[PDB]
Design an enzyme around this catalytic site. Sequence first.
Site, PDB file in Angstrom:
ATOM      1  N   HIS A   1      -4.545   5.442   4.877  1.00 54.12           N
ATOM      2  CA  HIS A   1      -4.293   6.683   4.179  1.00 54.12           C
ATOM      3  C   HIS A   1      -4.907   6.649   2.769  1.00 54.12           C
ATOM      4  CE1 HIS A   1      -1.649   9.735   2.104  1.00 54.12           C
ATOM      5  NE2 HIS A   1      -2.095  10.420   3.128  1.00 54.12           N
ATOM      6  N   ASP A   2      -4.749   5.541   2.052  1.00 58.17           N
ATOM      7  CA  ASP A   2      -5.328   5.396   0.713  1.00 58.17           C
ATOM      8  C   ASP A   2      -6.844   5.497   0.799  1.00 58.17           C
ATOM      9  OD1 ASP A   2      -2.754   4.907  -0.247  1.00 58.17           O
ATOM     10  OD2 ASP A   2      -3.166   2.895  -0.995  1.00 58.17           O
TER      11      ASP A   2
ATOM     12  N   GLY B   1      -1.162   3.501  -5.699  1.00 57.58           N
ATOM     13  CA  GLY B   1      -1.998   2.318  -5.768  1.00 57.58           C
ATOM     14  C   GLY B   1      -1.921   1.489  -4.490  1.00 57.58           C
TER      15      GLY B   1
ATOM     16  N   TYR C   1       0.785  -1.262   0.000  1.00 55.25           N
ATOM     17  CA  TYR C   1       0.000   0.000   0.000  1.00 55.25           C
ATOM     18  C   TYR C   1       0.817   1.314   0.000  1.00 55.25           C
ATOM     19  CZ  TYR C   1      -4.273  -2.601   0.601  1.00 55.25           C
ATOM     20  OH  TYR C   1      -5.317  -3.438   0.367  1.00 55.25           O
TER      21      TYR C   1
ATOM     22  N   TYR D   1      -2.255  22.546   0.601  1.00 59.96           N
ATOM     23  CA  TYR D   1      -2.976  22.970   1.802  1.00 59.96           C
ATOM     24  C   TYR D   1      -1.955  23.607   2.757  1.00 59.96           C
ATOM     25  CZ  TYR D   1      -1.246  18.467   3.528  1.00 59.96           C
ATOM     26  OH  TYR D   1      -0.386  17.439   3.824  1.00 59.96           O
TER      27      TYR D   1
ATOM     28  N   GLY E   1       2.858   3.657  -1.525  1.00 60.11           N
ATOM     29  CA  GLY E   1       3.300   4.044  -2.850  1.00 60.11           C
ATOM     30  C   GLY E   1       2.016   4.195  -3.633  1.00 60.11           C
TER      31      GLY E   1
ATOM     32  N   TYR F   1      -7.887   9.057   1.220  1.00 58.77           N
ATOM     33  CA  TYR F   1      -7.847   9.781  -0.041  1.00 58.77           C
ATOM     34  C   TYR F   1      -9.049   9.450  -0.910  1.00 58.77           C
ATOM     35  CZ  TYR F   1      -3.262  12.064   0.107  1.00 58.77           C
ATOM     36  OH  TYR F   1      -2.202  12.890   0.406  1.00 58.77           O
TER      37      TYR F   1
HETATM   38 CA   LIG Z   1      -0.981   3.643  -1.749  1.00 55.03          CA
END
Ligand SMILES: [Ca+2]
Length: 123
Positions: free
Chosen positions: A48-49, A32, A28, A73, A30, A52
Amino acid sequence: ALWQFNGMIKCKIPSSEPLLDFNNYGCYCGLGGSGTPVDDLDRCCQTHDNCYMQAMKLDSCKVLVDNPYTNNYSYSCSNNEITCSSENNACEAFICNCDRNAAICFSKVPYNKEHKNLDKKNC
Ligand SMILES: [Ca+2]
């Protein structure tokens, strides 16, 4: 954006170059990501993915042409603490929080060098 995320991690882990140390780690960390996270750091990246993806579902974000990676931000690092700015509009505020959460997550879990550049055959 990516440059703020890099800075938040160094805020919590001053000895790191996050773009080198945490990119391409596990299934996970990186661009994708799929499969079952290999360890807790990989799980920080999975969360985190997901964060997003959730940001992407917000009406506020769908108005900007800029994705989380390039969406700038405002935040500060002080005494190794991260503070997302009150001046961030809704989308940017959401992304800043996703970034703040992962940076702290990264700073609390073990780092396993054997998961760096992991063969995505494990994912
Ligand atoms: Ca990722």
